[PDB]
Amino acid sequence: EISEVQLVESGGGLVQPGGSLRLSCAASGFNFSSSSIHWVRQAPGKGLEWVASISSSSGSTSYADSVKGRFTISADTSKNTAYLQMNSLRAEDTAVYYCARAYIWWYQMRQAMDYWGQGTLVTVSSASTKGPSVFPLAPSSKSTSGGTAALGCLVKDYFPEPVTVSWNSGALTSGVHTFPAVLQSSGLYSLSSVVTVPSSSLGTQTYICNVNHKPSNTKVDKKVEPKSC
């Protein structure tokens, strides 16, 4: 911490509407009496939302209004590992949890947050763990000939992240757009892959969008073809 950051990975796991974990902020490299460990909530598509502020050197806490009441932060200066119990998990509670250091023996810094921690995502979903599939975004025949005949394939009903998609079985990635992993209504996700190529070569060549989803033991493929009804 003197020349590095010693905050290590802390409380890594997933949550469903029936789960709860004991998250930590596993600091090191300094003395908890010089700091005041914090936490924030960073929900997708939104700004930062701070949650808790404990100052071990007085056993204090200035609580928020979001996780108010339902939480508790209890730092342990002996073992050098704080502890916030992620209990009462709703869906809004999902975020990347930045928990960091906060120098308390220098008055100029009146906002603390000297450092910042990368975060161990709390991931609240519903009915997950379902192998993926591959679906061809089959380019029509009326695609722009000699111009751009866009082509690709949609992977549907897939969870959890991440899903590694390669093109020509890793032999090409140019023009491949990886769309953001956007939500479905069943809690699942959707990521699309679109490729750029003139319509001259689809007649002689065949393209195989490759998919590899390790968290489900499934590697699935499909040849991408220009649709001829």
């Binding site: 679906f135 061809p136 975004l137 029509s140 751009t148 866009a150 690709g152 649709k227």
Partner: peptide
């Protein structure tokens, strides 16, 4: 602009 038909596999 591009648009695609969801194939019969879908």
């Amino acid at each position: 602009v591009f648009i695609f038909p969801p194939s019969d596999s879908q």
